[PDB]
mmCIF file of C-alpha atoms and ligand atoms in Angstrom:
data_model
loop_
_atom_site.group_PDB
_atom_site.id
_atom_site.type_symbol
_atom_site.label_atom_id
_atom_site.label_comp_id
_atom_site.label_asym_id
_atom_site.label_seq_id
_atom_site.Cartn_x
_atom_site.Cartn_y
_atom_site.Cartn_z
ATOM 1 C CA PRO A 5 -30.981 -44.089 5.232
ATOM 2 C CA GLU A 6 -29.238 -41.493 2.990
ATOM 3 C CA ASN A 7 -25.432 -41.696 2.717
ATOM 4 C CA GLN A 8 -23.554 -38.734 4.241
ATOM 5 C CA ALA A 9 -20.738 -37.322 2.111
ATOM 6 C CA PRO A 10 -17.322 -37.520 3.799
ATOM 7 C CA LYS A 11 -15.574 -34.431 5.190
ATOM 8 C CA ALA A 12 -12.499 -33.294 3.270
ATOM 9 C CA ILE A 13 -9.735 -31.238 4.870
ATOM 10 C CA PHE A 14 -5.969 -31.020 4.736
ATOM 11 C CA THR A 15 -2.975 -29.155 6.093
ATOM 12 C CA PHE A 16 0.577 -29.024 4.689
ATOM 13 C CA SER A 17 4.146 -28.616 5.916
ATOM 14 C CA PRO A 18 6.269 -26.593 5.496
ATOM 15 C CA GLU A 19 3.953 -23.556 5.281
ATOM 16 C CA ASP A 20 6.465 -21.672 3.112
ATOM 17 C CA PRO A 21 8.191 -24.190 0.794
ATOM 18 C CA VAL A 22 10.874 -23.434 -1.779
ATOM 19 C CA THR A 23 11.168 -24.981 -5.235
ATOM 20 C CA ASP A 24 12.071 -28.679 -5.201
ATOM 21 C CA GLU A 25 11.514 -28.956 -1.433
ATOM 22 C CA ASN A 26 9.201 -31.730 -0.239
ATOM 23 C CA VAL A 27 5.799 -30.602 1.001
ATOM 24 C CA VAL A 28 3.835 -33.122 3.042
ATOM 25 C CA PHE A 29 0.087 -32.782 2.529
ATOM 26 C CA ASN A 30 -1.860 -34.293 5.390
ATOM 27 C CA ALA A 31 -5.568 -35.076 4.940
ATOM 28 C CA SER A 32 -5.743 -37.199 8.109
ATOM 29 C CA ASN A 33 -8.548 -35.137 9.687
ATOM 30 C CA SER A 34 -10.763 -36.046 6.730
ATOM 31 C CA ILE A 35 -13.489 -38.462 7.828
ATOM 32 C CA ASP A 36 -16.571 -40.299 6.662
ATOM 33 C CA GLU A 37 -19.085 -40.200 9.503
ATOM 34 C CA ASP A 38 -21.228 -43.150 8.353
ATOM 35 C CA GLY A 39 -18.662 -45.245 6.460
ATOM 36 C CA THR A 40 -15.011 -45.119 5.450
ATOM 37 C CA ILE A 41 -12.913 -43.053 3.038
ATOM 38 C CA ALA A 42 -11.965 -45.106 -0.035
ATOM 39 C CA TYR A 43 -9.479 -42.678 -1.575
ATOM 40 C CA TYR A 44 -7.908 -39.223 -1.670
ATOM 41 C CA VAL A 45 -7.479 -37.424 -4.997
ATOM 42 C CA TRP A 46 -5.120 -34.414 -5.180
ATOM 43 C CA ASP A 47 -4.743 -31.672 -7.779
ATOM 44 C CA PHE A 48 -1.481 -29.855 -7.016
ATOM 45 C CA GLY A 49 -2.398 -26.874 -9.228
ATOM 46 C CA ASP A 50 0.639 -27.145 -11.527
ATOM 47 C CA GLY A 51 -0.616 -29.713 -14.084
ATOM 48 C CA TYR A 52 -0.016 -32.836 -11.952
ATOM 49 C CA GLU A 53 -2.515 -34.870 -9.932
ATOM 50 C CA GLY A 54 -2.234 -37.907 -7.669
ATOM 51 C CA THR A 55 -4.246 -40.375 -5.631
ATOM 52 C CA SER A 56 -3.736 -42.349 -2.434
ATOM 53 C CA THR A 57 -5.749 -44.757 -0.278
ATOM 54 C CA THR A 58 -3.993 -43.180 2.739
ATOM 55 C CA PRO A 59 -4.337 -39.530 3.903
ATOM 56 C CA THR A 60 -0.764 -38.251 3.397
ATOM 57 C CA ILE A 61 1.201 -37.515 0.213
ATOM 58 C CA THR A 62 4.457 -35.703 -0.498
ATOM 59 C CA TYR A 63 5.054 -33.357 -3.429
ATOM 60 C CA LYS A 64 7.672 -30.978 -4.919
ATOM 61 C CA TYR A 65 7.032 -27.874 -7.039
ATOM 62 C CA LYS A 66 9.637 -27.100 -9.673
ATOM 63 C CA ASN A 67 8.725 -23.448 -10.260
ATOM 64 C CA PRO A 68 7.872 -20.615 -7.881
ATOM 65 C CA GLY A 69 4.287 -19.384 -7.693
ATOM 66 C CA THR A 70 0.975 -19.612 -5.901
ATOM 67 C CA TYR A 71 -0.826 -22.921 -6.412
ATOM 68 C CA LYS A 72 -4.409 -23.968 -5.613
ATOM 69 C CA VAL A 73 -4.351 -27.483 -4.143
ATOM 70 C CA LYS A 74 -7.689 -29.272 -4.344
ATOM 71 C CA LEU A 75 -8.384 -32.434 -2.376
ATOM 72 C CA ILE A 76 -11.320 -34.673 -3.160
ATOM 73 C CA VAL A 77 -12.186 -37.367 -0.628
ATOM 74 C CA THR A 78 -14.457 -40.232 -1.685
ATOM 75 C CA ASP A 79 -16.214 -42.653 0.659
ATOM 76 C CA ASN A 80 -17.034 -46.397 0.328
ATOM 77 C CA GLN A 81 -20.341 -45.547 -1.391
ATOM 78 C CA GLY A 82 -18.911 -43.099 -3.972
ATOM 79 C CA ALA A 83 -19.940 -39.795 -2.352
ATOM 80 C CA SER A 84 -17.312 -37.069 -2.233
ATOM 81 C CA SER A 85 -16.345 -33.685 -0.775
ATOM 82 C CA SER A 86 -13.637 -31.240 -1.753
ATOM 83 C CA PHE A 87 -11.368 -28.850 0.164
ATOM 84 C CA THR A 88 -9.135 -26.323 -1.626
ATOM 85 C CA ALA A 89 -6.249 -24.378 -0.114
ATOM 86 C CA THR A 90 -3.459 -22.218 -1.515
ATOM 87 C CA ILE A 91 0.290 -22.841 -1.275
ATOM 88 C CA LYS A 92 2.990 -20.303 -2.147
ATOM 89 C CA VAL A 93 6.334 -21.613 -3.392
ATOM 90 C CA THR A 94 9.377 -19.332 -3.566
ATOM 91 C CA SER A 95 12.630 -19.819 -5.488
ATOM 92 C CA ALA A 96 15.234 -22.038 -3.750
ATOM 93 C CA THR A 97 18.081 -19.973 -5.214
ATOM 94 C CA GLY A 98 18.301 -16.736 -7.181
ATOM 95 C CA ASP A 99 16.119 -13.630 -7.100
ATOM 96 C CA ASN A 100 13.580 -12.834 -9.830
ATOM 97 C CA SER A 101 12.561 -9.494 -8.246
ATOM 98 C CA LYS A 102 12.085 -6.400 -10.410
ATOM 99 C CA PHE A 103 15.141 -5.075 -8.550
ATOM 100 C CA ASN A 104 17.168 -8.123 -7.554
ATOM 101 C CA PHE A 105 20.727 -6.767 -7.871
ATOM 102 C CA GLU A 106 22.098 -10.173 -8.974
ATOM 103 C CA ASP A 107 23.910 -8.666 -11.987
ATOM 104 C CA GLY A 108 26.286 -6.789 -9.636
ATOM 105 C CA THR A 109 24.946 -3.408 -10.759
ATOM 106 C CA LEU A 110 23.356 -0.496 -8.855
ATOM 107 C CA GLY A 111 20.299 -0.885 -11.136
ATOM 108 C CA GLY A 112 20.345 2.866 -11.784
ATOM 109 C CA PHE A 113 20.146 3.733 -8.068
ATOM 110 C CA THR A 114 21.939 6.869 -6.806
ATOM 111 C CA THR A 115 22.273 8.720 -3.498
ATOM 112 C CA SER A 116 21.638 12.237 -2.246
ATOM 113 C CA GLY A 117 21.202 13.978 1.078
ATOM 114 C CA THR A 118 21.287 17.138 3.117
ATOM 115 C CA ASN A 119 23.199 17.273 6.424
ATOM 116 C CA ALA A 120 23.934 13.655 5.431
ATOM 117 C CA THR A 121 25.966 11.877 2.753
ATOM 118 C CA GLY A 122 25.184 8.434 1.370
ATOM 119 C CA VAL A 123 27.201 5.901 -0.544
ATOM 120 C CA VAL A 124 25.685 2.796 -2.142
ATOM 121 C CA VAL A 125 27.387 -0.379 -3.391
ATOM 122 C CA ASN A 126 26.264 -3.753 -4.701
ATOM 123 C CA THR A 127 27.110 -6.228 -1.929
ATOM 124 C CA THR A 128 27.255 -9.938 -1.065
ATOM 125 C CA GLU A 129 27.449 -9.172 2.694
ATOM 126 C CA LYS A 130 23.669 -9.274 3.163
ATOM 127 C CA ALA A 131 20.861 -10.092 0.735
ATOM 128 C CA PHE A 132 17.155 -10.789 1.147
ATOM 129 C CA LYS A 133 17.016 -13.119 -1.868
ATOM 130 C CA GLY A 134 19.814 -14.486 -4.022
ATOM 131 C CA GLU A 135 23.431 -13.643 -3.358
ATOM 132 C CA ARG A 136 23.376 -9.850 -3.769
ATOM 133 C CA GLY A 137 21.658 -6.596 -2.781
ATOM 134 C CA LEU A 138 22.499 -2.954 -2.071
ATOM 135 C CA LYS A 139 24.580 -1.702 0.832
ATOM 136 C CA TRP A 140 23.755 1.902 1.671
ATOM 137 C CA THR A 141 26.057 3.687 4.111
ATOM 138 C CA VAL A 142 24.932 7.058 5.475
ATOM 139 C CA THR A 143 27.067 9.551 7.385
ATOM 140 C CA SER A 144 24.811 12.149 8.979
ATOM 141 C CA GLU A 145 26.053 15.424 10.408
ATOM 142 C CA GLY A 146 22.874 16.110 12.385
ATOM 143 C CA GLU A 147 19.213 16.700 11.581
ATOM 144 C CA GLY A 148 18.837 15.914 7.908
ATOM 145 C CA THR A 149 17.630 13.587 5.214
ATOM 146 C CA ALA A 150 19.271 10.967 2.974
ATOM 147 C CA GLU A 151 17.831 9.260 -0.129
ATOM 148 C CA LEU A 152 18.583 6.115 -2.082
ATOM 149 C CA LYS A 153 16.730 6.801 -5.317
ATOM 150 C CA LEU A 154 15.965 5.839 -8.903
ATOM 151 C CA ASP A 155 15.052 8.511 -11.451
ATOM 152 C CA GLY A 156 12.729 8.197 -12.978
ATOM 153 C CA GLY A 157 11.019 7.710 -16.268
ATOM 154 C CA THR A 158 7.977 5.460 -15.890
ATOM 155 C CA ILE A 159 8.822 2.869 -13.222
ATOM 156 C CA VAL A 160 5.347 1.510 -12.335
ATOM 157 C CA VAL A 161 1.826 1.922 -13.703
ATOM 158 C CA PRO A 162 -0.652 3.705 -11.376
ATOM 159 C CA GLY A 163 -2.344 1.274 -8.960
ATOM 160 C CA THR A 164 0.786 -0.878 -8.475
ATOM 161 C CA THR A 165 1.805 -2.154 -5.049
ATOM 162 C CA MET A 166 5.585 -2.298 -4.616
ATOM 163 C CA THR A 167 7.287 -4.435 -1.960
ATOM 164 C CA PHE A 168 10.611 -3.242 -0.488
ATOM 165 C CA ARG A 169 12.953 -5.271 1.725
ATOM 166 C CA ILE A 170 15.114 -3.129 4.003
ATOM 167 C CA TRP A 171 17.614 -4.295 6.621
ATOM 168 C CA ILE A 172 17.679 -1.600 9.306
ATOM 169 C CA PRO A 173 20.443 -1.554 11.977
ATOM 170 C CA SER A 174 20.010 -0.737 15.678
ATOM 171 C CA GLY A 175 21.571 2.246 17.476
ATOM 172 C CA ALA A 176 21.329 4.445 14.369
ATOM 173 C CA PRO A 177 20.805 8.249 14.540
ATOM 174 C CA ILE A 178 17.509 8.032 12.636
ATOM 175 C CA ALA A 179 13.947 9.176 13.381
ATOM 176 C CA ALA A 180 12.139 7.497 10.501
ATOM 177 C CA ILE A 181 12.550 5.609 7.258
ATOM 178 C CA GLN A 182 10.204 5.587 4.258
ATOM 179 C CA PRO A 183 9.997 3.945 0.844
ATOM 180 C CA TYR A 184 8.501 6.463 -1.556
ATOM 181 C CA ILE A 185 7.373 7.039 -5.085
ATOM 182 C CA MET A 186 7.275 10.580 -6.371
ATOM 183 C CA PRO A 187 5.587 11.227 -9.740
ATOM 184 C CA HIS A 188 6.217 14.724 -11.090
ATOM 185 C CA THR A 189 5.710 16.689 -14.289
ATOM 186 C CA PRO A 190 8.896 16.723 -16.450
ATOM 187 C CA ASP A 191 9.622 20.317 -15.346
ATOM 188 C CA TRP A 192 8.900 19.611 -11.601
ATOM 189 C CA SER A 193 6.097 22.227 -11.491
ATOM 190 C CA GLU A 194 3.843 19.574 -9.891
ATOM 191 C CA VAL A 195 5.017 16.868 -7.537
ATOM 192 C CA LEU A 196 3.081 14.026 -5.864
ATOM 193 C CA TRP A 197 4.375 12.420 -2.700
ATOM 194 C CA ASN A 198 3.531 8.798 -1.878
ATOM 195 C CA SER A 199 5.341 7.024 0.945
ATOM 196 C CA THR A 200 5.112 4.421 3.675
ATOM 197 C CA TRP A 201 6.305 6.213 6.792
ATOM 198 C CA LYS A 202 7.845 3.996 9.502
ATOM 199 C CA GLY A 203 9.104 5.424 12.792
ATOM 200 C CA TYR A 204 12.442 4.045 13.966
ATOM 201 C CA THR A 205 10.753 2.595 17.080
ATOM 202 C CA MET A 206 8.164 0.788 14.902
ATOM 203 C CA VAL A 207 10.837 -1.063 12.937
ATOM 204 C CA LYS A 208 12.526 -4.479 13.312
ATOM 205 C CA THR A 209 16.138 -3.505 13.997
ATOM 206 C CA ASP A 210 19.038 -5.713 12.831
ATOM 207 C CA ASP A 211 16.547 -7.554 10.614
ATOM 208 C CA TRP A 212 14.828 -7.475 7.228
ATOM 209 C CA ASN A 213 11.725 -5.298 7.061
ATOM 210 C CA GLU A 214 9.165 -5.912 4.353
ATOM 211 C CA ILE A 215 7.386 -2.624 3.563
ATOM 212 C CA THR A 216 4.782 -2.150 0.819
ATOM 213 C CA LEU A 217 3.807 1.007 -1.057
ATOM 214 C CA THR A 218 0.985 1.662 -3.537
ATOM 215 C CA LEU A 219 1.158 4.217 -6.338
ATOM 216 C CA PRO A 220 -2.462 5.507 -6.392
ATOM 217 C CA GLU A 221 -4.635 4.727 -9.432
ATOM 218 C CA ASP A 222 -5.381 8.403 -10.240
ATOM 219 C CA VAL A 223 -1.741 9.365 -10.964
ATOM 220 C CA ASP A 224 -1.015 10.484 -14.542
ATOM 221 C CA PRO A 225 0.713 7.427 -16.122
ATOM 222 C CA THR A 226 2.877 9.671 -18.360
ATOM 223 C CA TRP A 227 4.580 11.547 -15.479
ATOM 224 C CA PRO A 228 8.203 10.619 -14.816
ATOM 225 C CA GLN A 229 8.678 9.003 -11.386
ATOM 226 C CA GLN A 230 11.324 8.970 -8.686
ATOM 227 C CA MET A 231 11.244 5.844 -6.513
ATOM 228 C CA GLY A 232 13.434 5.384 -3.455
ATOM 229 C CA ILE A 233 13.978 5.133 0.256
ATOM 230 C CA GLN A 234 14.303 8.206 2.453
ATOM 231 C CA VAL A 235 15.831 8.281 5.943
ATOM 232 C CA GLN A 236 15.380 11.136 8.430
ATOM 233 C CA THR A 237 18.481 11.619 10.575
ATOM 234 C CA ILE A 238 18.398 13.237 14.026
ATOM 235 C CA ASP A 239 22.047 13.253 15.138
ATOM 236 C CA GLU A 240 25.641 12.727 13.973
ATOM 237 C CA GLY A 241 26.667 9.157 13.136
ATOM 238 C CA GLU A 242 27.383 6.532 10.495
ATOM 239 C CA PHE A 243 25.012 3.634 9.753
ATOM 240 C CA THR A 244 24.447 1.007 7.057
ATOM 241 C CA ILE A 245 21.121 0.009 5.540
ATOM 242 C CA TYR A 246 20.680 -2.948 3.193
ATOM 243 C CA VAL A 247 18.102 -2.969 0.392
ATOM 244 C CA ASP A 248 17.132 -5.883 -1.844
ATOM 245 C CA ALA A 249 14.367 -7.588 -3.777
ATOM 246 C CA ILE A 250 12.179 -4.584 -4.604
ATOM 247 C CA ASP A 251 9.293 -6.225 -6.414
ATOM 248 C CA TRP A 252 5.865 -5.752 -7.983
ATOM 249 C CA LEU A 253 3.495 -7.436 -10.442
ATOM 250 C CA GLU A 254 3.129 -6.808 -14.208
HETATM 251 CA CA1 CA B 301 -20.490 -41.831 3.788
HETATM 252 CA CA1 CA B 302 18.997 -10.048 -4.446
#
């Protein structure tokens, strides 16, 4: 009459915790079909482990990151099963992004445009993470283009996915917006255009938009790079875009 191993499963809340916030892990749908569960053993993925004879446990992560949480459930006869899930923890305060703007600086960012003029300041009015970000005000005179840009030595290695956060307002005279990275030879004889084109109708207005962009792997790693955000304007008008927490790995 061979013993069946118990079934191990858990969920957690909140789905998106911050550092030092309580997460409740709930293994209550775990079950032994032919006996009872004796205990629940948890590995929180950060160096700490814990056990309970009951299916819930609460836990706090001190540092941001992505943790693998492994649950082992053991029945009254010593048979066990495991279930592993991932939890992402973000910083409760501050902003550790590659471009976080928390030092009050422009981070080397400048503006340019044609049939449009941009100004950029470091602001506390809106931020995606931390207390600060960029506030980019564009005055367009009609059909044109405006850039918020960083020149442009070697910003990222080829293959890198960048994440931009952009607060886009409603009722703006814009057709499209696009984060871009533009590698070029030092003398501009060869230029590569990489961008994530978003139409103005395909955008969350009066809200933060998370847009990713990959620099392709086959780009020459020695080429200087311009990274930025480009807006296409379609009519006269003044509008303000917020930019913060531009981030990538390595
Ligand atoms: Ca059993
Ligand atoms: Ca920030």
